[PDB]
Symmetry: D2
Subunit: 439 residues, 4 copies
């Protein structure tokens, strides 16, 4: 029985192409069993712990406790076949049905920051829609990704699925990703990664979903529950060491509440840097010569980052907080580290304007703490982000403490929003002329 891992990308694609042809003969009940199997794989406590620990050990990024939550979020709240609704319209001209049907072979690029969550979430959605999926995982997460694919293949084999619904290559690489993106039998590309790989998949001549960059501002105005806001912001920013695409990456605080907010942030585990010499040491540690984030620091804990500049703090410290001007690189750059700059502004309207500016027209994610329905509406409407979270941590936008389903492929540039099974399906219209209008 195939374990889904192939020596060459071309062999993987051919196998997934044959698999998806056979898959088309399977029932929706079969699909639901396979979907549940993937859930059972990642939600099995032993595998859940193994995937969460292994990703941290292999990538050096994130933390075990939060990957437990994120992997479980992927397993529990990714939509299954119930996502594939049917539209119907009946009248004098008969019945029209609109269905979500498979693309075929989907090629999926997955990140090193959420390797297992994206595989679980992509796999469930793509197989629910009747596709097979070829994964090109990031080489930095090769071992955990290949093991997850093999575990999924083992489970699907036990469930009587066609072999090779979920496949990858023995040696993930840029070149194998290139081969996947260029293979004629790949019908759609899905890229969860940085803007480079997204531009690439959108340059292949193929249908592509691209999950893009963010720089999420969190605005706090004078009407917010400041004590809850501080707790939410620390939790959101430090969740998996700031790896989630939605995670807070700069605070924009109205002046009249900024000090009390800072006070409560420190109460909730923020380590405040005031010494500009200490701040400069941190900028030297976490920024490249080009001014971008140091990969060696991405997804490291606040404790670890502080230890690297000679500062020893206990486990209660969750973020590194500093009040800085808006031009500071911690504000402008998407660090993907639990380093959270705060910019003080005079009014909520200034805060909204600055949040739009620093979000850089990524239109990805933004957060606001405010009880004023008018200011919540104004910021949400103006900033036009794929995800907008009000009065909660950023991960409420992923279904953790907010209503809705979860995803780990959030599509901004291509506009799909929170991808689910429907996103991996072709919309088909079936017209029964002058029949089946039984009203």
């Amino acid at each position: 029985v195939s374990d889904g891992v192939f020596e060459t990308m071309d062999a993987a694609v051919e196998a997934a192409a044959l698999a998806q042809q056979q898959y088309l003969l399977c029932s929706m009940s079969d699909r639901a069993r396979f979907v549940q199997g993937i859930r059972d794989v990642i939600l099995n406590q032993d595998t859940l712990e193994k995937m969460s620990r292994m990703a941290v050990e292999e990538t050096g990024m994130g933390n075990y406790e939060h990957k437990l939550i994120k992997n479980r979020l992927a397993g529990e709240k990714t939509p299954g076949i119930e996502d594939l609704t049917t539209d119907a319209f009946s009248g004098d001209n008969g019945l029209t049905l609109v269905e979500y049907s498979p693309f075929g072979v989907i090629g999926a690029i997955t990140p090193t920051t959420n390797p297992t969550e994206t595989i679980v979430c992509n796999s469930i959605g793509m197989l629910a829609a009747g596709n097979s999926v070829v994964f090109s995982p990031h080489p930095r997460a090769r071992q955990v990704s290949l093991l997850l694919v093999r575990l999924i293949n083992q489970k699907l084999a036990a469930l009587g699925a066609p072999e090779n619904l979920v496949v990858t290559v023995e040696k993930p690489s840029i070149e194998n990703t290139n081969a996947m993106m260029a293979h004629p039998k790949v019908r759609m590309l899905v890229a969860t990664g940085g803007p480079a790989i997204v531009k690439a998949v959108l340059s292949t001549g193929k249908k592509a979903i691209g999950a893009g960059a963010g720089n999420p501002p969190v605005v706090v105005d004078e009407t917010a529950n400041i004590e809850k806001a501080a707790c939410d912001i620390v939790n959101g920013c430090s969740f998996d060491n700031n790896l989630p695409x939605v995670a807070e990456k700069e605070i924009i605080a109205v002046a009249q509440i900024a000090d009390y907010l800072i006070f409560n942030l420190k109460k909730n585990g923020a380590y405040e840097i005031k010494d500009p010499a200490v701040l400069q040491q941190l900028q030297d540690l976490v920024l490249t010569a080009k001014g971008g984030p140091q990969t060696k620091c991405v997804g490291k804990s606040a404790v670890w980052l502080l230890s690297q500049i000679g500062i020893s703090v206990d486990a209660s410290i969750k973020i590194i907080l500093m009040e800085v001007p808006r031009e500071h690189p911690f504000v402008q750059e998407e660090l993907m580290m639990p380093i959270l700059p705060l910019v003080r502004v005079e009014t909520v309207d200034d805060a909204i304007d600055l949040a739009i500016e620093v979000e850089h027209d990524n239109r990805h994610t933004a957060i606001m703490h405010s009880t004023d329905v008018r200011k919540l509406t104004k910021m949400a409407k103006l900033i036009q982000t794929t995800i907008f979270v009000k009065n909660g941590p950023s991960y409420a936008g992923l279904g953790a403490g907010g209503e809705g389903y979860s995803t780990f492929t959030i599509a901004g540039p291509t506009g799909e929003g929170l991808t689910s099974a429907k996103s991996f399906a072709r919309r088909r219209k079936c017209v029964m002329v002058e029949a089946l209008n039984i009203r």
Copy 2:
């Protein structure tokens, strides 16, 4: 006041970019007024006839009568702002709203087969979704396209719209089209045209919706209403001289009813060619040396085509019919001419199998005449086309005699189906954590 036509593509794109920024400040009521304005433009009887006549004259393709119908179909049954529905979910974690918001500037490539219908349909959908649109019309439809753009800009100015919501260039060209595709301020590309241009917009690094090619088979089995089938098939095949992407392009008839079908086809205006020499004359006329359709004959009437091989017939002749083997170029090629080959097969199951084969995995459009719900289901399910029409003319798939809305941008490889305003919008999720859950 700008008329919407610019000397350079870069000027058109920059003007649309400013226009859309201003458009974001307009109400949904404003959008509805602008949508209605575009409907009023094309549905105005004088403009309706002028657009239909000018398109036929300038392109040499289609017929005036059917372009009246198609332009009216675009003006009347293209969804407006009511397409932009809202999803809501409420519970213990509060309320989550999901909305359709604008992309920004959309670059739209329009074909010379449906120049005005596509402009009307794209404009309504894209403006309804809060976008501006830059059109790159086909050079062979330059004059009618630019006049429509001018008339739209005139109407929108009278309605108080931002200037330059709908723009184009003075000199349409493949060079200007490539310039639009490369322009950084174009946020999404929409290509209604051949596979080459669709592959191109999908190779730009941008979100792109691409139309697809088809080769629509119409299967007729022994349970069909043969008299109605023959009428539907002639009407559908000869609609705008076989220009529509959905139009029937080969008949696959169960042998037991083929002769009765052919008899009724002839009664409905089919000119049957049985002389293999006359057939060869037709092939030499309508096929290039490479075997593809001759541009000079695309969209020409059956009367005109027969006259070019010296056969004079009255206006009651709508299609040219011939019984040929499946390998014949008229079967294999997407002629876009009212030339309709018929292949005879033993059983409905063979008809379904052959229909799948000759559709060439375009998964675009197929048609079936049959009253057997099992065979209707089998063919529709297996052939997996974006549009499937049962017991009607192909154009029932576009809302003309079938339930649903109309479009003239039917997505091919990108899977949106019949594009509408929704297709030109980004999906946005707004999460009100632990509030607005008022159940």
Copy 3:
């Protein structure tokens, strides 16, 4: 042709029963034409003004300018056949369709407060769903109701409807109403009226929709836009002289803003009574010996009510306002007069508790002015009213300045909410076993 007005209730019902049998043979396109026909009847400006003036002059209740708005609201925002959506579910077991189909003959009881609005709203919804309707109008609004029915029948005759889709009797009476309730061919009763007649239609052994009483509190807390709240409250309370079921009938104001609210209410046309002797005069005028509203005062203007106690004011006076304890009859009673008591409370939580109490478990309508999303949510969730309006006049709950459709039959005990065509339809399920599953 029949003008739809019959000498006996039995003849009206028999005619409507035959009409609906014939109506079943009409298309959805026919239904849509008839719906548009009724809209055209009431939306014709000259007819709109005639109906509005005639109702006020015949009943003595309401005012002309606002009946213009309400009749237009009924004609413009009552859902048509688009309300009758189709649900579909497809899978291994085939296709299931769920449709909204006619009840048959519906007997509709209409009020003297909104005679023409209810006839328009009921007629459009009931005919859209494929029913016929027998109206039993209130005797006080006899002639305006019969004139509307005759105009509908004339319009429908011209549009080619079966005669007698909409019928009534020449002499409305409680006896004819009882005969409608008792008639075996009436398949559903709809009662828009006071609780006695609603209890009656729910005691007939028939499916019945019943209106409810209300006593709508409007809460204003310290976060509200007080200037806007004052304007909204005056407009909502005095709308058609407080006849609408949704209209504000007591203010519960948080002490922090109560005086400034009263100040702004007076600037918007509130006449404030502080003299307890004058207040006692008003109570003597508007209350019966048993403490309920005087019918002779229901729907009278504030100008008229003040003149009846010897106070002469100009037309800028829209409501009579008094700060009183919660036990005051004007708070406790649904006056249906532009008399608006204000009760002052310590906190928004006290305001919510009191609003729930004085709403008397009608669960009909409540209104809140507050910008705190938490307090808006708390009150909306706790008071459990069929309509809840936030930061607007009460009539925004009927589609006048709020999103959604309008109705003038807001169900009370029967739970349908804002009745529309769906409410007048039977839900039917059509199961195509193992076919038409074409995904």
Copy 4:
């Protein structure tokens, strides 16, 4: 023209007044519970009936106490109620946003619901009603039939035990120690009952609609199954025998007369007998069965309702093995077996000339119940015509009638099928009041 077709309180109270008062207090407390709480309680009810020992006990006990139905099929129907009754996911939200802000439409509780349950589906209805009503945030007072007293009270106690272990307010689901029609009348009259739900015959439906309260009435049917010449006749015979004999013809949807186009009627009958139909051709034997199963007034004998074909045949001296599932007879349309809703595995066949005649006759013998009808036909035009004209709450094409209840057809299940009051297949939504929340000029974030 093919002649072969085409191949701690336990929830049980001394008086109705006490039960209603307890459920009213319970529902006030329930309003403070979260949707997560409701979901736990819904799952608790599912766990009660789907527990294998309780599933078997409920199914066996209902048959033994009522004398109606059969154990194997009540296992299926009870499991169908537990598995496919919608939960809180039924309570969807509508939203509309624009220049005037945001409007939300929600499904909110009625309060105390009084539910009358039948002796033909006593546990399935309790399970199905309980799940839907609690999902929507109501409490429910059950008034079961005296003939199903013991099994109904046990189920209520088991539900109360489970909900107590899950931390629910006491008495979300209640009933009375002594079920009686008089207690049903008392429940219908109680001021604190906000809605009545009646799963029963036409008299009880009329009664709940005569109370001054909102009532959902799930009425009678007489479901015809039309078979035309385009049908898969072999499958139709199998489906018809299975649907008619399901729980001994107790389900409201079950086939109760065949209307067969003449050209396939004999081949259909041959296949019906192949699939377990015992055909009576002897008019003397047919008269014997009529004397057995019809009362002096001509209605069904309660002693025979829900009895097996085997048992019914034995009562007229005919011994057959357990492969016999229905008693089949070809008769004129006027025959009482056609006209009456027997709720017995007795299935008359009426032969007609054409499918259009079959449709006309099916409409006629369905008696404007507009409840359930079934058609076997592959012709999309005749399927549409019959479905459109007969206007039934449930229409099943090319399957057994119980495919209309989510068993072999798409959709959810219910055991309260509302024709007269029009709710259709009742679910949690049906037990909720629609509420509209209008946020004027805010929360329009498009």
